[PDB]
Every structure is written in C-alpha cells, then in structure tokens.
Amino acid sequence: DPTWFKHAVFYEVLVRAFFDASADGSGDLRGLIDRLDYLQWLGIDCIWLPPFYDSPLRDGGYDIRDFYKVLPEFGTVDDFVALVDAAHRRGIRIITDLVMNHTSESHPWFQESRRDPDGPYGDYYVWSDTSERYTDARIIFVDTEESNWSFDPVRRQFYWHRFFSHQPDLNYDNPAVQEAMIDVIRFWLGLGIDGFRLAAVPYLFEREGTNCENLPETHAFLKRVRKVVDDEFPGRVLLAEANQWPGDVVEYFGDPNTGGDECHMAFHFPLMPRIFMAVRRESRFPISEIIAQTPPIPDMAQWGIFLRNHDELTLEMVTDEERDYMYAEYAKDPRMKANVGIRRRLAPLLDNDRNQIELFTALLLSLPGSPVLYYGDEIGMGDVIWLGDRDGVRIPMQWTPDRNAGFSTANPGRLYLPPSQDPVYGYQAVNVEAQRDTSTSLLNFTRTMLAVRRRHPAFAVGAFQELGGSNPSVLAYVRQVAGDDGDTVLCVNNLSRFPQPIELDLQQWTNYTPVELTGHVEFPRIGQVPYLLTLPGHGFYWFQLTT
Amino acid sequence: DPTWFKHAVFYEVLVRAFFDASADGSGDLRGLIDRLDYLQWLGIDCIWLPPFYDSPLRDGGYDIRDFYKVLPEFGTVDDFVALVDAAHRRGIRIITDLVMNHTSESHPWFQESRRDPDGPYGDYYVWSDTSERYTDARIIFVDTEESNWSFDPVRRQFYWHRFFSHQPDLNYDNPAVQEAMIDVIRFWLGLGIDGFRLAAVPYLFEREGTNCENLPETHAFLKRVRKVVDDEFPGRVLLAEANQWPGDVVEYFGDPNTGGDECHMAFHFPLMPRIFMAVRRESRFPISEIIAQTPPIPDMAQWGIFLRNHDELTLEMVTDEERDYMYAEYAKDPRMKANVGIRRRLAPLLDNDRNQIELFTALLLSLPGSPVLYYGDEIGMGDVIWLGDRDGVRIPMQWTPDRNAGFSTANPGRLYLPPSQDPVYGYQAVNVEAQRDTSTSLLNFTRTMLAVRRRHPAFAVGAFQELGGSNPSVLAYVRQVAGDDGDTVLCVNNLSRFPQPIELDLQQWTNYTPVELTGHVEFPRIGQVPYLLTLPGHGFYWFQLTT
Amino acid sequence: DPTWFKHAVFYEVLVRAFFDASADGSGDLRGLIDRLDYLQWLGIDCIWLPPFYDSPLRDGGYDIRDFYKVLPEFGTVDDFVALVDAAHRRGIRIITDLVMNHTSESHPWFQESRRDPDGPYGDYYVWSDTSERYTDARIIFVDTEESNWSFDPVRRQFYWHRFFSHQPDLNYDNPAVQEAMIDVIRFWLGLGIDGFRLAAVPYLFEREGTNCENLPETHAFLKRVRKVVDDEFPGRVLLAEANQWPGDVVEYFGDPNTGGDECHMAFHFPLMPRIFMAVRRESRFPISEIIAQTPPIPDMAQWGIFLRNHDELTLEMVTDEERDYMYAEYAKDPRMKANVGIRRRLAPLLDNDRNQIELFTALLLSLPGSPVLYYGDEIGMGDVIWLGDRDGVRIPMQWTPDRNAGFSTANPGRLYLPPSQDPVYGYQAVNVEAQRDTSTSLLNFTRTMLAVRRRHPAFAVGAFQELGGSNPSVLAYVRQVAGDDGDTVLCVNNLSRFPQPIELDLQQWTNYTPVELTGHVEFPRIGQVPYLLTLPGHGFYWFQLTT
Ligand SMILES: [N-]=[N+]=NC[C@H]1O[C@H](O[C@H]2O[C@H](CO)[C@@H](O)[C@H](O)[C@H]2O)[C@H](O)[C@@H](O)[C@@H]1O
Ligand SMILES: [N-]=[N+]=NC[C@H]1O[C@H](O[C@H]2O[C@H](CO)[C@@H](O)[C@H](O)[C@H]2O)[C@H](O)[C@@H](O)[C@@H]1O
Ligand SMILES: [N-]=[N+]=NC[C@H]1O[C@H](O[C@H]2O[C@H](CO)[C@@H](O)[C@H](O)[C@H]2O)[C@H](O)[C@@H](O)[C@@H]1O
Ligand SMILES: [Ca+2]
Ligand SMILES: [Ca+2]
Ligand SMILES: [Ca+2]
C-alpha cells in the first residue's frame, strides 16, 4: 500500500469522553465501534488513540503500570482487536501512543527496584545522591514540582523524575531497559496496529554539562528502533514530537542523504503558537517568517500540521519572549497553566466567533502537511477551565441534548466528569443531533471543506510559495504539485476583521483561469497587470488555476 | 443566661454548601446573614459551624494553615463579626468547631520546624526516628495509608502523623505548644462566640506502650482548658468528640463529686450505629441495652444526641465484630471506606421511606439529651457515592430547582461541586421551595415536631424509664421530669413494618389521662390492668399524661 | 366466568395521553399493546377505553363523526383487533364506551337532515318550530350554553341539542334510528370485545312536560337492547351510568322479580361526591347513611364503585345545598366549571398527604362497589387547570423524567398538551420510572393493596355490615361472605387527622382471632366486652377474623 501518511487527516479520539457502551460512566473500546460511523461520515481516514493501559489515572493515563494489558475499565485486550478489525474493514487507520521517559511508581519494575538494590530491576531508574547533578536542566511544570530530584525513603537515595513526582524517568543507559522498552514496540505491532507515535522523545537521555534534552545520543536509539520496525514489520509511521526551536533540533527525520532512517513524521510545534499570534496581530509575517525559517525536509516525510491537542497550547521555549503578548491577549482572567499554554480549547479562544473558526480550519486544512483534529472542535465546544489539572480540555463530547449530554445511560453522578453546562458552550447549545441537520452548521461546513480537500491530490504532496501583495494583512500561497501539467491550486487567506483589497502577482502562471472550488465560478483570466481581488473579513478562497 | 445546653437544637450548617452571595461557587459568611430567617422559620436556636479557617481545602478545612484568619474566600473577619451581631439579635447561638490536635503541612510553625531545628519551633512537633515508636495505636484511615509514620526529605527523620500525613500532630509535651493553642481560644472567645467543639480530643498526649488514645494525661490539659474557659469569659458551652466504647471511656465529664470540670457536653457516638441496627433487625433490645449500659453523667451536662454528621457514616470502629452485619444490610453498595464504609446520608440510608425517616426524627427529638440536626435532612436530600472521599455527603444544598439548584448565580461549571442530579434524590425531586407549602412535606413535619418539642420541657431536662412490654418489637419511654407535679410525657415507638399490639405496664401511674400531644384527643384512663394499644408500621404517639 | 365483573378491577385508560408508538404526538393503539405489561404487572384485570371513533376532537372526542371507523391517527381496525387479541391473551378483558344521545354536526346523517326536510334522514333528529317544547329539562353545560335550542340556519327550524351546541340529539321516537343504534352495537361486539359503557342513558327519550330524564320508555328501550346483547353473544356484560338521585332514579337494573333484564352494573355517583365531604368533615355519617339510603340491588348485578373519572367532580343533582359547603373547602380559587364538580385530580385535590391518598385507595378497594381506577391515580399526578374546558384532567402520562416526560420521542411541539411542569407536580418529580425502585412508593403500595385484595373472596362477593362506635370520626365494616366458613373480613378506617381511640361492639363474633392481612400479625382474641383499637391519623386496618 502507499505511503498513506502524506494523504490523510488524523483524529484524536480520546478513549474516554467519546461513548459509554456499558453504562459505566466512562469511555469504552466497544463503545467506539458503535460510533465509528460518525467518523467515516465525517470523512476521517486515520484515527489516533492516546494510551489506555493499566495506569492509575493520576495524569491523563500517561502513568503506565503495565505495557502488556489494556486497562480493565476500557474493555479487555480482546476488544482492542475487535476495534482494529472493525476500523480496518471500513478504511480507517489507528495509531496508538507509546510513551517512554517515565513509568508510574507502581510498575513492578519500580516497587521491586527501590526495595532491592543490586537486584536485576535495580538500576533501571536513575538513582544518584546529591541535588547537584544535571543542575542546568529546565523544569517543565512550574506549578506542582519544584525540585526535579525528590527523595525516596525506602532506599533513602534520590530518583530521576522529569515530569511529575510519581513518574521516575527510566535510565536508558542500562542495556537491558532498551530491550524491555523495545519488546513492547515489537508486540503491539503484532496486533495489526498501523504505526505508533512516540511521546516525549527529546528528554530520553541526559548528561552533565549539557541541557539534558535532545542529546546526540537519543538519535542512536531512535535509529535502532526505526531499523527494528523496518526489518520486522514494514510500513508504519513512527510519528514523533519536537516542541523545540525550529532550528535543526526538531529534525528527527535522519540523514537526508539516505532519505530516511528515523521518525517518519513530526509535529509543527514551531508554527502552532504563531498562527494565533498572526491572526490577532493583523499581519502575515508571524506565519511567513516561521514557515521560512524551518530548514528543508527529506523526500519521504510529512510535517504533521495541527492546531490543538489534549494539552494546553504549549507556549514554551518554542516561542521567544513575545509570550508576554499572548498572555495579555488570550490569557485574561488569569489562567496561565505553568509558564506554558493557556489551557483553553480552540472555540473558546476565539470568542466563539464563527468567522475566525472557519478561517483557522482553512489554515490548518491548507498549510504544508497533514492535519490532525481534536475529537471536538468541529462543534464549537471547550472551556470549563476551573476543573483540576488541565482537564478543561477533556470534557465528554456533547451528542444529542438528552440527560448527561447523551454521553451515556447511567446516573448523572457516576460520570467520570460532568458534561459542560456553560450558557454558551453547553450541551444544550452545541450538539451533534442539533447540527447534523442544518446545512450550514459548523460540523457540515467542515465536512464540506474536507470533501473539497480530497478531490485535489495537490494539498498533500504539493509545495509552498508565498506570493504576497501590497496589503500585509492577508497571505496567499500556491500548493503546486510536481511534474508536467501540475495539479496547481491557489489559496488567499485574509487575516483582518474587515474586508481588504489584494493585488496578487500571479503573472508567472499567465494564461490561466482561476476556477473556483466552492461553486466552480470561473473567475477572470490571469492577465499580466497586478491581479486584483477583494475579500471580506476573515474570508478565503480555494481556486484551481486550470489552463 | 441559663444553662441552655439542654433546651436547644443544633444545626450542622457548613459554611460552604449553604449559600453563595458573591457569585463565585462556594458558601460565604455573607451568605448566611440574609438566610438566617429560614433557620428561625424552622425552629432552631443554636447554629453550628465546622472549621472555616485559612487553610488549603485539601481535607474539609481541618488541614489548617492558620489559626487566626478566616479563609479569604469566605469574606473577612468583619463578616464574621457582622454574622454574630445579626444572629444573636434573633436569639440563635453560634458555636464553632475547633481543631487543636494538629496544623497542616503548610503552617509557618511546621516549616520553621523543618529544615532547621534548634530554633524556637524545633519541637513544636513530635519529631522521632525509626518505625518502632508508639507502635500500639491502630491506623484510622486503613484504606489510604499503610505505615502511620511517614518520612521527611529535608530532615530524614519521622513525624507522628495520625490522620493524613499533611497535618502532623503537634508535640504536646512542650509547655509552649499548649500555651499558644490556649491563646487561639483567648482570641476567638473575644468576638462574642458561644463555646467551641473540640476536634479529636482523645488523641492528645501519647506515651509508649499505651494505645495513645484517652491517656490518663490528656484529661489534665482538658481540665486546664476548662478552667481557662470558666475563669475568663464565663458561661461558654464546650463540647467533645468521644468515639469510644459505651460509657467505659466515652465518659469525658468532670469529677461527679465536684459537679463538672471537663466537656460541658458530649456526642453520643456509641448510640448512633445502633438506632439503625435495631430498626433493621426488628427489635428494641439494641437500643435499650446500650442506652442502659452507659454509666450516668454529672447533673450539669447533657448527652448530645445526634443521628448523622459529615463522616463515613455510622462509625463502626468502636462496636464489636457483630457490627459486621451493618455491611450486609446498610452497605450493599461495594463502596465502604475508612473501616466503616457507608459515607451516605440519612435519607438514602432508609431505602427512601417516608415512615422510617419520620420515626427516626421522632427518636432523635425524643431520646435523652439535646439533638444535633444535619443541614440536609429537613428536605429529604440524598447523596453521591461516586465522588471520592467523604465529599459525597457535602453536596450543595438543593433549594429551588430553577438553575443549579438555586444555590448560586454563576457558571454551572464553576461551583466547587455539582448539585446532585439523581432521578430520585436531586435538586428537582426534593427542594425547599417545592416543600415549603404542601403539608406532610418533611420540611413541615419536622418543623411541627420541633414546635411541639419546645412546649413540653420533659424531653430536655427529663428523666428516663423503659416501661417495656410483652412485644419485643416496640419501645416505650416515660420522659418524666423529677419533682412534685412535674411535666410528664410518654412515647411508644414501633420498630416493625407490620402493625403490632402493645401491652404496657403503666400501673405506676394509675388514674392518669394520656392527653395526646398532637391534637389532644383524650384516651382511656390508665387502669390497674395493663394498658392496651395498637400501632401500624413505624408509628409513634406522644402522650402528655396529664393529672 | 358467567360474571367476571365481581372479581375484577377496571382501569380507565384514555387512548391519548398513554403512549406514542409512532411519534405522532398523540396516543396510539400500537402504543398501547406495547404497555400491556405495566398494566398486567400492576394487577389490572379489565381495561377501559373512552371514545376513539373517527370524529372531530372538539369535545373530548365525544363528537362522533362515524360509528364503524377508528380514528385515522389511532391506527386502523386491524390495530384494534390486535389489541383485543393481545389483551385477551394476558387474561385481560376490554370494555369500550358508547354514545347514544348525540352526534357531532358532521355525521352524514345530520348533513343529510340539515337540508332535505323530506327524506330518509329527515327524521333522525329532533326538529321543531318554536323554542317552548320540552321546557323542563336541565342546561347541563350551564357555563357556555344558554338556551338549549339551536337554529341551524340551512333549514330555518330548531333542534334540541342536549349537551353542547354542535351535538344534536338523536330522535329515538323514530322506529328507524333505534335500528342503526343497535347495528353499531352488534358490529362492535362482533369485533370481539366484551362489555359496553352505555353512556348518557338517562337522556334518551325526551317527553313533553316532564324534566326529560329517566322517562319510562328509556328503560323499555334498554330492556330491548339488553335482550339483544343477551340472546346472541351470550356472556357479555354491559355497564351503565346514572349521576342521579339514589333509588328508583337509579333503577337501571332489571326487575327484582326476574333477576335482571337491564344493565349489568352501574356507577355509584350517589356516593363518590360524598367520600370527600366525609373525609374533610371528620365524620362517618355522610358515607354510612348514604350507603344505607341506597335501595337494594338485584342479586346478580355488581355495583361498580369509583372515586374519580375524566369529567369534573360532578357534584350536582346528587347533592343537596351541602355542595355550597364543598365549593368553599375543596376549591377556593375560581376553578369551578359549570354548576357541577370541580376540574381537579385526586392528588392535588387532597394536597400531597400520602396518608389521605392511601386511605382513599383503601376505601375504594374496600366498599361494596367494584373498584375503577383512573390512570394517574396509581401514582401522585397533578393537573393543570388553566387549559380550558375539562382537558386539564387528561394531561399526558409521565413515565420517566426524560424529554417530554418519556411520553413520546417526537418533536416537543407535536404533543397536543404539554406535560405538566409545576414545582410540586411535574414529570420531573412524579415519574412511573422513579417510583418502580423504592418499595414504599405509592405505586408499589397500590400494587400490594391490589395483590392482597385478590386473595380474599370476600371484598367483592360479600355482604356489608356497619358497626359504629363512640367516635363519629371512624368507619367500620365487616365484609362477611354468605355461607359457612366465608372469608369474613373486618375493616377500620379513620377520618380524623389526629390519632384516635376506637371501641367497637363485635359481640357477634366471640372467639374469633383477628389475624391482620398485611403481615399476618395475630391480634388479641375477640372480646365480648367492647374491642378497643387505637389508630393513627388517616389509618386503616384489614383484619381477617379467622377461626
Ligand atoms: N506542559 N507541557 N508540555 C509540552 C511537552 O510535554 C508534553 O507532555 C504531554 O505528554 C506527556 C507524555 O507523557 C505527558 O506526561 C503530559 O501529561 C502531557 O501534557 C509532551 O509529552 C511533550 O512532547 C511536550 O514537549
Ligand atoms: N473517619 N472517621 N471518623 C470518626 C472520627 O471523628 C472525628 O474525626 C474528625 O476529624 C477528622 C480528621 O479530619 C475528620 O476526618 C472527621 O470528619 C471529623 O469528624 C475524631 O477524629 C474521632 O472522634 C473519630 O475518630
Ligand atoms: N360533566 N358532565 N356531564 C353530564 C354527564 O356526563 C357524562 O356523559 C357524557 O357527558 C359529556 C358528553 O359526552 C362528557 O363530558 C362526558 O365525558 C360523557 O361521559 C355522564 O353521563 C355523567 O357524568 C353526566 O350525567
Ligand atoms: Ca530521561
Ligand atoms: Ca498528638
Ligand atoms: Ca334524546
């Protein structure tokens, strides 16, 4: 089969908050095989499932306690196979997250470790006295944790946790830990899962003096894992994560000369915190510059464009000291979660204003790379920030407006979370049964946009070239495919509230007719004088530029 | 200013979960000034107040981080003074809870007692070493903790935490820790407050080998505190928290010869878990043996009868292993915590019966000693087990059912907890506005019972006699007041679903006419032959036995 | 089953307001066969059915527009045959209504008579030329109608409409209409149902001079119709209804000598408007004296008691000026419709005193008449009284607290009348699904009472002796059975709020042990001296007087 990660849109279907198929007030794998038709109807080809393993849910389940067993709440591991079989016989791809760099303080490998120095599971985790080692590494959570080392009583030594107080980072130097964190990678691929993500890759190895992140030793292990995947089972997308400066530190794609020997796909973290900056700043540079700075990429790796995920809009080092602008713009009513992010969903971030919403949908549907959509955001939900942790972005999705937002058929007290009841973004104001009918509802509009993004095999294997006109508050680009008689396209996105005039310079494509895509309204021929256009506030076009 | 310990009913109104006059999602001390009228309309005279001092609300508010300032959320201390001024004018006495056994793991004292001993606060806490010390007392919370000692990374030593490990018990041997705690009272009593309820008194001074509870020396400091209270600001009702064996230890009153030199009252903990095990077993013995097995009390103190409070429900740690059938009857739900495991409220306990609830309210208002009323039992409220911790019995009060249970005028997602929404026990099925007009509604039955109990001073300062009869499924009293031509009264409470015939033994009162208290419908004159009555399921009468 | 109506309980179920099997917005026969398990689980044994024939729904569906056709929106004759052949499988018998003395002004008969003064249908209706004939009848609908003669301008004459303006009376003097009015009965019986509630019987023949009510010829015609139903289709009952003064005015049974040659039952309108005044007046005279003033009955006919039906309280023509008292106690607000009973349902009539409701259910199931329950009395349901006319007593049922009270899944605008929403009465507070769990719910209490009443063949086929004591405010019965070792039964019912002593003279049953029925709690053996029982306010006992 083809590369299939160049042409695809990913969905973040949290196994929780989607559907309760047994009245347990929580998600369920067998509860997703019954709503695996809303996805196909929506036109989504690859599904992405965050981890669901045996893990006391102290932090969104990223506290694995066993990498060999499905959490009993979310059905057995004989229901994951059913989900895979049902999502393969319908034309959908599912990738399951795999997280390294930690383990909950309950895995036998840790309890039997702190209680048994010199035992086999003795040096798996990082144990070393003193609070001076790696004294230059930054601290991520500037709210809960404040030491990054902590103190373990039973052994009285220290331990190395990079994320929380109950997540001891594994010491990968021990050449036996990198045979039990790789035997998992060689097991789930045996179930037929098509590719698996890698989470928190930059923080694996840490050595003194350096910054402790993205050391030139993680990449050796990544190359080893990629070679293992290639030799054992070909054709899987080892999606990755960077959240680093664009530079050369985000490129985990391997040596360009070979073409690819590492992660097949990254995430556009450098650009995610700048789309909003550009949109509110009424300009296009905060996006054009960021797309220009990033170096080139190999010929067999996509770029993973996206807007929001199950995190809090990580406004970290990725952004320079202009964070003081986004704090004062998107973070009034203090809700700064740590020094990173704003902890708000897409729709609330934009005053629920529809125009900005479809503008951003177009921007993530056209810019270089495949899009990834959070399970909501196609209805206009979110908010409910006041809950503990960053759990204002994991409320159950709001289907039909019956009791408990049609999530399940149990008591409204047994639900693991209460469906929102905001006067605006409530479960009685933004539904799925109240939007699948109206032909201009946001769900249907995004479905249409997806529909017109599959009839041009030029949005996924194309190119990028910013044309630019006199007006600085609007950008344009041409996703032209390669070869003779290219499947050229055009895009002209506004970035201001009002309507503006644009003087494009498409003379390089002279003798071309800009056939529209919304309604096939043949526009004026591409003359030689400055091409002229006039757009409304937050408006956009998707031309075709045919001969 | 009389004793008033006896002629008084107590309301367990939490500062939170009651009202919200600031539109923030939590009870406010300004939320009681404009609501006190309702209490005066229900027939109450003394309004209780659990802890509300400046503290992280990590457990209830007993995790005190300061003993001198009100929590900033609940207004300011001037608001407390205004509450006192506007509640005394109605003749309602306010008494606050007071926790002195411990302060939270954030108090200035604990911090300066950590990381740098040898200072003035070096031994404001019980600092020890090794897990062999005071190794006789049981662990209370046997569901979360496992060791009861804990550690400390900044000093490597151990601290004797008794409850949770974030509010370590103070070391009471110093004549400095207990010379400031007796200043907290010095301050609070200066605002016009009326007494205090000591929290977890038994767990003062401990010594090796003993059980650390009820040690002969705690009473020394108790007598000192009583002398302090009496000498300055005379006439303030104290209380106690004695969850010990019946009368064997619970006896916490001063020398009987000298009248009284300890707690001015007490909470009849040994009785609570029995009012239930008698009604379920269809017999009266368990309510009689343990009401007689208890020794007497000094004739200057009451006996604090209550039926439910904010706890794990029916504390079952001081009753023999034959309270192990209050798991197969009252705890069918597989959710039992803290070695007793019910965590429900009064109404859901009694299978939602309108007869049993009224029977239990009658018993509460009838048995010896002044009663304590829990805030959510004059409506018929329920509970939510699946809320974690004992917070399931602290859901906000369900007033009018319009919006978020009329509790507040803020976002439904902003409240600290979601108002109950069960089909049977919700802010729609049970309300105050929906039960404040229709007679026979519990809010009116209880009001009438209280109004009748405030006109016959024979339940408060009266004697007690168990008439007994041929029927082993009904209990009778005579709450006569000792004296010449006193105010006699009778009570005959059934304990069986089906109707029963009763043959009492009132021959000691020959030639008295039982003028019934409800409507004054006279009865047959008492004759030398046994007096004969019949009752339906779970019924009662309150005869006046006039001359 | 020669009679089957002595050991039977009837349930009035309006075909609308009971369910919705096709999302129409109204009842449905296919929406009733689905629910013939809730009725069969309750214990009902003969369903009831008001009018449903093809007709405009201008007057509660009593404006017949055809006789052989089922209303289009209730299904077809196939659906009715399915209902009859299903309910006849679960030991359930169906009896339908029938209208004889009116026909909406849309029937082909009346449209053909309106014009064409000479013709086959010219004498199927009453017609005159001046409005003086029959000047001694009653204006039943005193509120709207004012003359009782209507003009019909097409013909320029006068017609004599009994009840309402558009309901012209038939003319039974014609020897032809008495043939269609028997063919309709023959056909409807031919479908398979058994029984008929001959309606508006005491108005058929309108003679000159007299009041036009109970004219001697009416009984002759009824004798003819009963003979018709008896000679063919043997074994079919046929009820009746009077709403007249007790005695010969309710002679609608046969000639006592012949056993019976008229209606097989009757509706005890003399007594229904008297239970309420007996209970609210705190006495027993209005019930016992009235049950004694009713003349005897033919030995082979039941008496069919009830408590409330779909009409108003109908307190007129069967009540003296004592009704002037009831208007001042049972309806203080101006909600008295016509010059007859009030438009309120049982529950709201009494307030929510569950004791009163239980007492009324006991009286209904105990007294001589066979019970007739009305849907919505089985639980505590309210009634909206501003809906106009008398439809406020036929609100749609309330099954569950889901959307539109779980009545129907259709859009919440189709429903003819919105489900109630009052704070005390509503579909959120009194739901047949929120009361099927608790074992004290009014629904369960009624089910248990019906279950017990079925085990003693002495509540329906037994005699009736009143006893009387010293208190007027109590009622006593001994429903003995003729013959040796009949299932004797005693009943004591209170009628005063406060508990009462009660001394009865049971000297005729010496040496009889009163075993109670609810729990089998044996009572003291019957005493030659007055038996003494003490009963709580609004209470009752059902002893069995075994040997
Ligand atoms: N905060 N923050 N930041 C972005 C940073 O961290 C993420 O953390 C998420 O994933 C880890 C993986 O276990 C999980 O522990 C956290 O709960 C999630 O918020 C990403 O892992 C990482 O790639 C980002 O750079
Ligand atoms: N669990 N429990 N039990 C009974 C307990 O009652 C008091 O406990 C008070 O203080 C604790 C400490 O936070 C609090 O959790 C309870 O809600 C309070 O009632 C006393 O500690 C003692 O009498 C009993 O052990
Ligand atoms: N009310 N009232 N009325 C008179 C009469 O009512 C019953 O008969 C019918 O009366 C009208 C006309 O159909 C309608 O409102 C009732 O539902 C019908 O049953 C009975 O005959 C009896 O209640 C009264 O005599
Ligand atoms: Ca690491
Ligand atoms: Ca201590
Ligand atoms: Ca007539």
Numbering used by the authors:
A (entry chain A), B (entry chain B), C (entry chain D): 40 to 586
Per the authors:
Mtb persister formation is dependent on the trehalose catalytic shift, a stress-responsive metabolic remodeling mechanism in which the disaccharide trehalose is liberated from cell surface glycolipids and repurposed as an internal carbon source to meet energy and redox demands. Specifically, TreS-catalyzed isomerization of recycled trehalose into maltose is a key step in the trehalose catalytic shift that promotes Mtb survival during stress. Although TreS is not strictly essential for Mtb viability under favorable growth conditions, it is required for the formation of biofilm persisters and can therefore, in principle, be conditionally targeted as a persistence factor.
Previously published results using Msmeg TreS unambiguously identified the aspartic acid residue corresponding to the D238 residue of Mtb TreS as the nucleophile that initiates the attack on the anomeric carbon of either trehalose or maltose. Therefore, we constructed a catalytically inactive Mtb TreS-D238A variant, which was used to obtain a cryo-EM structure of Mtb TreS in complex with a trehalose analogue inhibitor. Following multiple rounds of manual and computational real space refinement, clear density corresponding to a disaccharide molecule was observed near the C-terminal end of the β-sheets of the barrel where the active site of a TIM-barrel fold protein is typically located.48 The observed density for 6-TreAz was stronger for the D chain of the tetramer compared to the other 3 chains. The 6-azido-glucosyl moiety of 6-TreAz fit within the cryo-EM map is modeled with multiple axial hydroxyls as that is the best fit. The structural alignment of the published ligand-free TreS structure with the solved crystal structure of wild-type TreS protein incubated with 6-TreAz shows no structural differences. However, as shown in Figure 5C, the 6-TreAz-bound cryo-EM structure shows significant movement of the L19 and L20 loops at the active site along with the H9 and H10 helices and L8 loop vacating the space required to accommodate 6-TreAz binding. However, the E280 residue, which acts as the general acid, moves slightly away from the ligand binding site to better accommodate the ligand and afford the acid/base chemistry essential for the enzymatic reaction. Additionally, D350, which is essential for coordinating ligand binding, moves toward the substrate and forms a hydrogen-bonded interaction with each of the two rings of 6-TreAz.
